[PDB]
Copies of this chain bind each other. A is one copy, B any other.
Amino acid sequence: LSPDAYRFLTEQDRQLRLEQAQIQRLLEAQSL
């Protein structure tokens, strides 16, 4: 990977984790 691609993938990793956390918060709020 180029340095640019490496940087992009590290940023994508953090963003995927943030999206997971947001989804988890929404799902956990759905009281039955």
A16-28 to B contact mask, C-beta < 8 Å, 1/0 = 1101100110110
* Copies of this protein chain in the complex: 2
Residues of B within 8 A of A20 (CB): 13, 16-17, 20
Q: Is the CB of A13 within 8 A of B23?
A: yes
Chain B residue at minimum C-beta to C-beta distance from A14: B20
Would A6 and B30 be within 8 Å (CB), given that A13-B24, A24-B13 are in contact?
yes
Least CB distance from A20 to B in Å reads 4
Q: Is the CB of B26 within 8 A of A1?
A: yes
Using a CB–CB distance below 8 Å, which chain A residues touch chain B?
A: 1, 6, 9-10, 12-13, 16-17, 19-20, 23-24, 26-27, 30
